[PDB]
Design a protein around this ligand. Structure first.
Ligand SMILES: Nc1nc2c(ncn2[C@@H]2O[C@H](COP(=O)(O)OP(=O)(O)O[C@H]3O[C@H](CO)[C@@H](O)[C@H](O)[C@@H]3O)[C@@H](O)[C@H]2O)c(=O)[nH]1
Ligand SMILES: Nc1nc2c(ncn2[C@@H]2O[C@H](COP(=O)(O)OP(=O)(O)O[C@H]3O[C@H](CO)[C@@H](O)[C@H](O)[C@@H]3O)[C@@H](O)[C@H]2O)c(=O)[nH]1
Ligand SMILES: [Mg+2]
Ligand SMILES: [Mg+2]
Lengths: 360, 360
C-alpha cells in the first residue's frame, strides 16, 4: 500500500545532466525517470509514495506539479546519510508502521524495466521472485551478484565483486515487510543492510531491464525501452509519431512529443526521443539520441547516440555523436563536431573535439 | 601570332586529381585551367597555340573536343625533358620560326590572373611590363624572386631562394622574340634558361594572381578569381546562379553550371563551384568548395574548403572540411568526417579521419 522510492543521491555518473536537476527528475524518454515507476505503482494497488530526497530538496515543486495523478506528497530529510539510503526507510520507520501493516515496496529511481508489480501475492518469497527473476543476466562489473538456486534461496551478496561470475544481479526493485525496517536501524550510513544469509522465504525479471544511470547505459536502456512501449503509448505505422511538422521520414520506432516541431526531410532514427517544445531543423538525423526539452537544432546536424540537454541551441551543421552528454543551456556553433565530449551547463562550444573529454 | 602553353608536367603537387587527368585539364571553376588561358589568348590577337605535352598525350581527345573555338591542334613530344620544359620551345624551334616572325607567348598551364594580354605594343621591354608587373608581391617560398627597379631591368633570377626577401615573383606569363628560341637550345633539360644578366631592354599583373597548382592554392585562387568573373559570365543578384533546383539560398558569389541540380534549402557558400550534371542534396553547405563533375551529394553534408573529384558519390551526412582533395570515383559512406585527407581514385571511405593524411 506504500512504496519507498529512493531519490536521494548525487547522480555522479550522469553528472552533466544532474548538475541542474536530480537524477530521478532527468527525463528518460519523455517523462522523468521516477514518473515511470510512480505510474507502475499507480497501476498496482498503492496510493502513498514516500521519497527519501537528499541531494536536492527543491524537487518538491516538480513533484507537486506531478502530484495530480498520485498522492506522493511525503518528503523526509534530516541530513545526508547515503545515496544508497539504507537508513532512508529506517529514518522513517514511524510513518510506514502506524498507518498500515502491509508490505512496502522499495525501488531505485534510476531503474527501467517491464515493471511487473504483479497482483500475485508471492507470499512464500518477497524479493526472490520479483527484482532479479530466476530462470539481471548481464555484466558483473556493476550491481550485486545474486546466487539463487532453483528453490529461490539467497546466501551470497557481494556488492562489487572483482571477478566472481554470477551474471544474475538484482533488478533494483525490492519488497519488504515491516520486520525489515525494525530489524537493523543502525541510524547511520550503510549499504542495503542485507542479512539474507540468516533467512529464506520471508522479510526479503522477465522483460528488459537496464540501470539507467550512466550516459551509455541511458542510451542502451532507451533503445531497449522504446520498442516495449509501442503497445500502450499512442499505439504512420513505423513509429509512435510520424507527422508533426512538414513531412519527415522515420526509421524504426521513436517517441516525439506532439508539442515538438520537425523540419522538412528530417530522419528521426531508431529509438530516438524528442522533448516538449523542441525544434528540429530541416534535414537533421536523430539516431538513438534524446533531446530533452526546449532545445533547438539547425539544418543538417546528426546527433547520434548522445544526449542533448534542456534549453540547448545546437548549431546548423554540427556533429554530436558517440556518447557526448550536453548540459543545460549549452550553445554549439555551426560546424562544430563533438565526439564523446560532455559539456557542463551554460557553455558555448566553438572548437572541434575529436576525442572523449570534458568541456568546462 | 603564336603561343606556347607549357602543358607537359606530372602535376605532383595536385596529385589526387592529376592521377586521372593532366594538370592543365583539371577544371578550375567550371572549365579546365588551360581553357581560361586559351580564351584570353583568343581575346588578344592569336590563332595557333602549340602545346608541349609530356605527362599524358591522351589529352589530345579533350583538346579536339575543345578544338572548335581555336586552332590549338599543334602537339609535339619526343621524350620527357622537364615539367618546366625549357627545351619545349627549343625542341620545336622550326615550327615557330618558318611560319611567322612575330613574338610568341609562353605561359604556364597552372596560372590564373586577370590575363591582360594588352594590345599595346610594349616593345621597349617584352617581359618586364607583363608577367610580374612592377608597382607577385607574395611569399618567396615558391616561384623566382625577380629584382626589378623602376627602369624595368632584371638582374637576379633565383628559382627557389632560401631567404632572400623580394616579394615580387614572376606571374608565369612570358613573351619572347625569335632570338630566345635560337639563343640557348641545349637539347636537354634546363630551367627557363633565363640570361637576364646579359640584357636589359626588349631582348626578350595589376589584378589578382595565383599559382593554381596546389590544393590550398587552388582554393585560394578560386576565392580570388570568382569575384573578378562577375562582370562577364552570366552577369537572384547575390551570385551567378541562384535558382536552378527547388529553392536554395546563396551566400556571396558562386558558379553553378545550369546542368546541375540543387536541393531544397542548400546553402551554396562564398566562392563555390558546382560542375556539370552534379547533384547537391537537400541541405548541403558548399563553402569555398569545388565540385568537379557528375558528383552526387547526400542530405546535409558540409564540404568546406576542399575539392570533390569527378564521378564521386558523397554520403548523406558527411563533413569534408579543411583541405581534403577527393579523387575520381571516390565513394564516402554516411556520417564519415574527412578533415584534410586526400583520397586516391577508386576508393571507398567508411572510417573517420580527424587528422591530415592520405587514404590509399
Ligand atoms: N547516484 C544516485 N543514486 C541514487 C539516486 N537516487 C537513488 N539512488 C540510489 O543510489 C543507489 C546506488 O547508486 P546507483 O549508481 O544508482 O547504483 P549502483 O551503485 O550503480 O548500484 C546499485 O544499484 C543497482 C541497481 O542497478 C543495485 O545492484 C544496487 O542498488 C546497487 O547498490 C541506488 O540504489 C539508487 O537507488 C540519485 O539521484 N543519484
Ligand atoms: N607539375 C606540373 N607542371 C607543369 C604542368 N604543365 C606545365 N608545367 C610547368 O611546370 C613548371 C613548374 O612547375 P610548377 O609547380 O607549375 O611551377 P613551380 O615549380 O611551383 O614554380 C614555377 O612556376 C612559377 C609560376 O607560379 C614560376 O615562378 C616559375 O615557372 C617557376 O619555375 C611551370 O612553369 C609550369 O608551366 C603540369 O601539368 N604539371
Ligand atoms: Mg542505479
Ligand atoms: Mg606552377
Amino acid at each position: 500500500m506504500r512504496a519507498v522510492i529512493l531519490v536521494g543521491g548525487f547522480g555522479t555518473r550522469l553528472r552533466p545532466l544532474t548538475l541542474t536537476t536530480p537524477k530521478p527528475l532527468v527525463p528518460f524518454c519523455n517523462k522523468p525517470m521516477i514518473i515511470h515507476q510512480i505510474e507502475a505503482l499507480k497501476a498496482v494497488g498503492v496510493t502513498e509514495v514516500i521519497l527519501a530526497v537528499a541531494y536536492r530538496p527543491e524537487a518538491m515543486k516538480e513533484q507537486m506539479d506531478e502530484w495530480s495523478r498520485k498522492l506522493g506528497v511525503s518528503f523526509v530529510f534530516s541530513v545526508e546519510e547515503e545515496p544508497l539510503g539504507t537508513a532512508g526507510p529506517l529514518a522513517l520507520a514511524r510513518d510506514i508502521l502506524m498507518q498500515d501493516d502491509k508490505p512496502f515496496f522499495v525501488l531505485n529511481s534510476d531503474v527501467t524495466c517491464t515493471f511487473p508489480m504483479q497482483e500475485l501475492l508471492d507470499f512464500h518469497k518477497a524479493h526472490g521472485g520479483e527484482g532479479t527473476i530466476m530462470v539481471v543476466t548481464q555484466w558483473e562489473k556493476y550491481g550485486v551478484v545474486v546466487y539463487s538456486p532453483q528453490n529461490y534461496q539467497i546466501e551470497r551478496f557481494v556488492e562489487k565483486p572483482s571477478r566472481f561470475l554470477g551474471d544474475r544481479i538484482n533488478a533494483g526493485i525490492y519488497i519488504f515487510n515491516k520486520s525489515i525496517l525494525d530489524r537493523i536501524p543502525p541510524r547511520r550510513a550503510s549499504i542495503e543492510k542485507e542479512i539474507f544469509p540468516a533467512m529464506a522465504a520471508e522479510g526479503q525479471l522477465e522483460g528488459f531491464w537496464m540501470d539507467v544511470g550512466q550516459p551509455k547505459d541511458y542510451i542502451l536502456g532507451m533503445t531497449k525501452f522504446i520498442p516495449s512501449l509501442v503497445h500502450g503509448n499512442r499505439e504512420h505505422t513505423e513509429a509512435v509519431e510520424h507527422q508533426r511538422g512538414g513531412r519527415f521520414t522515420v526509421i524504426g520506432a521513436s517517441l516525439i512529443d506532439p508539442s515538438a516541431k520537425i523540419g522538412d526531410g528530417a530522419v528521426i532514427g531508431p529509438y530516438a526521443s524528442i522533448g516538449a517544445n523542441c525544434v528540429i531543423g530541416e534535414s537533421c538525423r536523430i539516431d538513438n539520441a534524446a533531446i530533452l526539452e526546449n532545445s533547438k537544432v539547425g539544418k543538417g546536424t546528426m546527433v547520434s547516440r548522445s544526449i542533448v540537454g534542456w534549453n540547448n541551441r545546437i548549431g546548423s551543421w554540427c556533429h554530436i555523436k558517440d556518447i557526448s552528454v550536453l548540459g543545460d543551456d549549452v550553445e554549439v556553433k555551426d560546424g562544430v563536431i563533438l565526439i564523446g565530449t560532455k559539456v557542463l551547463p551554460n557553455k558555448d562550444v566553438g572548437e572541434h573535439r575529436f576525442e572523449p573529454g570534458i568541456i568546462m
